[PDB]
């Protein structure tokens, strides 16, 4: 059938389709070309998704869920998760060492949701938007992720798709999708393109070559917990302390108060893109009293300057890894909602010595546009030809060797799909199991990198130490996801080598439990 492209964003999501030669961003049932990544459950038992969920946040905050993308594929003890909890109105609890979301679903029934199930509900809304527009069932999709998403975060996003009833044919990196929207129908030789993607939750920078429909990522770097949400948090913080200094009251108590301030901070940020002052006004803020303050552009910039300035470091890194200088960059493409902030535009322009970014790119829609194009390439119904994409892995994959040392296996910025083999043996006589720990990151010791998984090679036949010869193959697929397999290569009595792991990701059984649910 028809394959759609869905930009699943931290705060807003967007769906498009590429067919009959052209790209069409699809408007939702309220006429909006983007949909808030919000889900809500009313006291009466009704589930809301999108605009309807966001517009009742301030009256039903405990049972309104959002920012699931900053929770997805992480652990409960993650310092990033514990930071966000302070500003979210819904209960986040530990389960299987992951953060799960607890709400009342209506008729006083408590339920606990994985972050994947929340994102699945958002995907279900985007799928129904496309189904209405096209007048047929949509079972196939391309879905986006930040370029710097790790292995667990990627897989978790695919699982969300599966829970939504979608066959996710491809996971495309957000900056690559944005580059497609820019470069589609450029016919002017090889160009070096830098994409600067600062959204509602994640930050990516990617350097690409684009040449008459052939797209190739050279280098990428970013931060998966840096975006609009962090800028909003710094401003919310400033006003919670300000209110406490004026009245002696801690609004951290009342969830309505905190989320009323969120709603107003969002509007004030938007206004500060085209004016230098904005009024924060809340009727019935805390215990009936109202809130009335002004935020200047200078104060907003003051509160976030460290975060804004930190976006320049990943830019320096991709130039160093690509072996290119500033003057080699032919075009700068800004995408993501936070690139509308004037200070972000100034920093980028000053870093590239006065160079203007490209016009004709809507930063909220450009990623969905390219996602739609990649979707069409994978269907005979929609494929025009003249579209070749080569992407890379964002993180160095290595194995833990003796002393907690990171031994590199596949370096960062290697084109995918790719694979690498290594032979392992045993350390003692008749050892039945060999354990391998895979890590993601650039630091020399595994303690300072991120653990992808602990893999056990079981069923190793009895032999003296050092005799067995097990070839383990590590394959990163086109989606950027790792698969590990093992073969016995010995000169003797062999066996099937079975691999188990310690990874916390969802099994098809659990997905089937969730897919055979959510009709409630």
């Amino acid at each position: 059938g028809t394959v759609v492209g869905i930009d699943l964003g931290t705060t807003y999501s967007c769906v498009g389709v590429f067919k009959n030669g052209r790209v069409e961003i699809i408007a939702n049932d309220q006429g909006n070309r983007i949909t808030p990544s919000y889900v809500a459950f009313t006291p009466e038992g009704e589930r809301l998704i999108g605009d309807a969920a966001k517009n009742q946040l301030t009256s039903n905050p405990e049972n309104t869920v959002f920012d699931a993308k900053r929770l997805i594929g992480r652990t409960w003890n993650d310092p990033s998760v514990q930071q966000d909890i302070k500003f979210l109105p819904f209960k986040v609890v530990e389960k299987k060492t992951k953060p799960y979301i607890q709400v009342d679903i209506g008729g006083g029934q408590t339920k606990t949701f994985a972050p994947e199930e929340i994102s699945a509900m958002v995907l279900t809304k985007m799928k129904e938007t496309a189904e209405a527009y096209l007048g047929k069932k949509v079972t196939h999709a391309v879905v986006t992720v930040p370029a710097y998403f790790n292995d667990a975060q990627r897989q978790a996003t695919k699982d969300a798709g599966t829970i939504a009833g979608l066959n996710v044919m491809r996971i495309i990196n957000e900056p690559t999708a944005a580059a497609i929207a820019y470069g589609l129908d450029k016919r002017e030789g090889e160009k070096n393109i830098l994409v600067f993607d600062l959204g509602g939750g994640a930050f990516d920078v990617s350097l690409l070559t684009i040449d008459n429909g052939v797209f190739e990522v050279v280098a990428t770097n970013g931060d998966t917990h840096l975006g609009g949400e962090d800028f909003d948090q710094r401003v919310m913080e400033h006003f919670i302390k300000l209110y406490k200094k004026k009245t002696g009251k801690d609004v951290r108590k009342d969830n309505r108060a905190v989320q009323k301030l969120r709603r107003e901070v969002e509007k004030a940020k938007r206004a500060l893109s085209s004016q230098h002052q904005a009024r924060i006004e809340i009727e019935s803020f805390f215990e009936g009293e109202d809130f009335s303050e002004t935020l200047t552009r200078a104060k907003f910039e003051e509160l976030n300057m460290d975060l804004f300035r930190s976006t320049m470091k990943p830019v320096q890194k991709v130039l160093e890894d690509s072996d290119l200088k500033k003057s080699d960059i032919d075009e700068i493409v800004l995408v993501g909602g936070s690139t509308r902030i004037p200070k972000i535009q100034q920093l980028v322009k000053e870093f590239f010595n006065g160079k203007e970014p490209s016009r004709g790119i809507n930063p909220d829609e450009a990623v969905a546009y390219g996602a739609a194009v990649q979707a069409g390439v994978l269907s005979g119904d929609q494929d025009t030809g003249d579209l070749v994409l080569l992407d890379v892995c964002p993180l160095t994959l290595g194995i833990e060797t003796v002393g907690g040392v990171m031994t590199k296996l596949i370096p960062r910025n290697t084109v995918v799909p790719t694979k690498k083999s290594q032979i392992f043996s045993t350390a003692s006589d008749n050892q039945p199991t060999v354990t391998i720990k895979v890590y993601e990151g650039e630091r020399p010791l595994t303690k300072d990198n991120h653990l992808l998984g602990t893999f056990d090679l079981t069923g190793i036949p009895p032999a003296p130490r050092g005799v067995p010869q097990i070839e383990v193959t590590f394959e990163i697929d086109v989606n950027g996801i790792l698969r590990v397999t093992a073969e016995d290569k010995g000169t003797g009595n062999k066996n099937k080598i079975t691999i188990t792991n310690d990874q916390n990701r969802l099994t098809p059984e659990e997905i089937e439990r969730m897919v055979n649910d959510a009709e409630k």
Side-chain angles (χ1 to χ4, degrees), residues 195-252 254:
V195 180
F196 185 95
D197 178 25
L198 187 66
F203 174 57
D204 293 307
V205 185
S206 290
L207 186 276
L208 302 85
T209 62
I210 305 185
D211 189 6
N212 283 271
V214 179
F215 300 82
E216 174 158 33
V217 182
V218 171
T220 188
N221 185 246
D223 186 332
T224 65
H225 208 250
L226 175 57
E229 176 55 28
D230 302 280
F231 315 142
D232 290 356
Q233 282 180 20
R234 292 290 190 78
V235 180
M236 288 168 73
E237 261 292 291
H238 171 68
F239 284 120
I240 287 159
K241 292 217 176 63
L242 188 141
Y243 198 72
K244 186 169 176 183
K245 273 189 271 201
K246 283 173 58 165
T247 68
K249 271 160 253 186
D250 207 324
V251 300
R252 196 75 66 171
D254 192 357

Side-chain angles (χ1 to χ4, degrees), residues 43-95 97-136 138-184 186 188-252 254-269 271-276 278 280-312 314-337:
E44 292 70 16
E46 205 204 330
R47 190 186 75 187
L48 308 173
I49 316 180
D51 292 301
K54 199 195 180 182
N55 299 316
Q56 59 80 80
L57 173 67
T58 58
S59 41
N60 183 37
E62 293 86 349
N63 304 304
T64 304
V65 189
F66 59 97
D67 289 339
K69 193 169 171 184
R70 287 158 70 86
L71 302 178
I72 205 170
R74 289 173 189 277
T75 63
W76 163 263
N77 63 358
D78 194 334
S80 292
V81 173
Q82 298 298 311
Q83 177 208 309
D84 285 349
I85 282 164
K86 294 198 204 300
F87 303 87
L88 300 167
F90 51 87
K91 189 182 288 192
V92 188
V93 295
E94 192 179 15
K95 182 180 165 181
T97 76
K98 292 167 74 217
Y100 275 59
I101 297 151
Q102 192 174 306
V103 290
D104 181 10
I105 60 157
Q109 201 71 11
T110 307
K111 186 162 178 184
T112 301
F113 291 99
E116 291 95 322
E117 297 177 79
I118 298 305
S119 300
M121 286 169 182
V122 175
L123 289 174
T124 296
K125 172 60 172 194
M126 305 316 282
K127 190 182 81 168
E128 283 164 6
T129 295
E131 286 179 356
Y133 182 81
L134 296 167
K136 66 200 80 187
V138 176
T139 53
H140 294 91
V142 169
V143 181
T144 66
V145 295
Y148 216 66
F149 256 21
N150 67 30
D151 193 272
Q153 295 171 299
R154 287 173 189 280
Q155 185 61 57
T157 304
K158 265 199 85 204
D159 295 350
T162 309
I163 295 156
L166 291 168
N167 177 355
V168 182
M169 297 182 78
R170 181 64 54 76
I171 295 289
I172 186 164
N173 298 314
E174 286 162 11
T176 311
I180 293 165
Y182 162 83
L184 188 69
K186 291 289 191 299
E188 58 182 46
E190 193 176 313
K191 287 284 134 68
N192 299 316
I193 308 303
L194 185 126
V195 180
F196 185 95
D197 178 25
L198 187 66
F203 174 57
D204 293 307
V205 185
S206 290
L207 186 276
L208 302 85
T209 62
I210 305 185
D211 189 6
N212 283 271
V214 179
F215 300 82
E216 174 158 33
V217 182
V218 171
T220 188
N221 185 246
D223 186 332
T224 65
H225 208 250
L226 175 57
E229 176 55 28
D230 302 280
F231 315 142
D232 290 356
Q233 282 180 20
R234 292 290 190 78
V235 180
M236 288 168 73
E237 261 292 291
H238 171 68
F239 284 120
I240 287 159
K241 292 217 176 63
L242 188 141
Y243 198 72
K244 186 169 176 183
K245 273 189 271 201
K246 283 173 58 165
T247 68
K249 271 160 253 186
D250 207 324
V251 300
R252 196 75 66 171
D254 192 357
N255 287 307
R256 288 166 147 275
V258 175
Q259 306 312 319
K260 274 173 172 176
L261 184 60
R262 174 185 290 286
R263 186 196 58 200
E264 290 293 289
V265 166
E266 276 157 14
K267 296 208 284 280
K269 181 165 68 176
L272 287 175
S273 294
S274 64
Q275 264 160 353
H276 89 114
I280 311 288
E281 294 284 9
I282 304 160
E283 280 193 54
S284 191
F285 178 54
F286 186 76
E287 307 182 318
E289 306 300 317
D290 56 50
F291 187 86
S292 191
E293 295 297 314
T294 296
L295 179 63
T296 66
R297 192 187 283 153
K299 169 58 72 170
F300 175 74
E301 290 168 4
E302 184 163 17
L303 294 158
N304 287 301
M305 192 55 75
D306 65 311
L307 302 178
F308 291 173
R309 230 124 210 166
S310 78
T311 64
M312 301 299 96
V315 180
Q316 285 150 47
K317 289 177 186 182
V318 298
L319 291 173
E320 286 157 0
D321 288 346
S322 306
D323 314 79
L324 289 164
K325 293 133 65 171
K326 290 175 179 180
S327 58
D328 296 316
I329 303 301
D330 297 294
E331 275 266 69
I332 297 161
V333 179
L334 301 176
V335 291

Side-chain angles (χ1 to χ4, degrees), residues 342-385 387-446 448-470:
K343 184 53 54 168
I344 298 287
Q345 294 172 25
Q346 192 190 342
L347 290 166
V348 171
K349 196 185 156 180
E350 287 186 23
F351 184 86
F352 288 108
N353 303 306
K355 183 168 174 63
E356 286 293 319
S358 312
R359 317 210 305 270
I361 307 299
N362 185 340
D364 304 315
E365 300 184 0
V367 173
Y369 190 105
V373 174
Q374 172 65 97
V377 169
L378 308 181
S379 190
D381 184 64
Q382 304 160 251
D383 185 20
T384 53
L387 209 308
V388 182
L389 197 175
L390 273 58
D391 214 327
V392 307
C393 71
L395 295 147
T396 293
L397 265 52
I399 60 152
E400 180 168 273
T401 49
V402 67
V405 178
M406 181 69 168
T407 294
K408 297 170 204 190
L409 199 76
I410 302 161
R412 66 176 183 278
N413 303 318
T414 306
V415 170
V416 294
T418 192
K419 54 190 170 198
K420 179 71 182 188
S421 283
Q422 191 179 307
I423 297 166
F424 294 84
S425 196
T426 54
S428 55
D429 290 348
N430 297 336
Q431 185 175 331
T433 301
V434 173
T435 301
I436 301 159
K437 290 195 194 301
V438 179
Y439 283 84
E440 299 162 297
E442 316 312 314
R443 309 297 303 287
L445 303 182
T446 49
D448 304 313
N449 292 316
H450 181 254
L451 175 59
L452 193 158
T454 305
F455 301 89
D456 292 325
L457 316 175
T458 69
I460 294 166
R465 72 190 192 78
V467 177
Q469 292 279 278
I470 313 298

